[PDB]
Amino acid sequence: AKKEHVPTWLQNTHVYSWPKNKKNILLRLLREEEFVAPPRGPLPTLQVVPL
């Protein structure tokens, strides 16, 4: 296949290539993301210094 063979309405999502992206296909089926972001921390402590 190629890029164009995808129906247009399906081009608005992720397109996986077999067998190149088989791990990504597995992840998508598991409903799990490849990247996991770190938990959001607190805003940095703001220190004041004179000059």
Add this chain to the structure above:
Amino acid sequence: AEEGALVAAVEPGPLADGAAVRLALAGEGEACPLLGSPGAG
């Protein structure tokens, strides 16, 4: 009549000074993210 008036020098009396205020961020670091899952045959 030379005693009519006198010349005067003007100065700014109540002068004041102060220091500039600069901001800084305390501490720094970075927690690593997680990624990956195994392929299969």
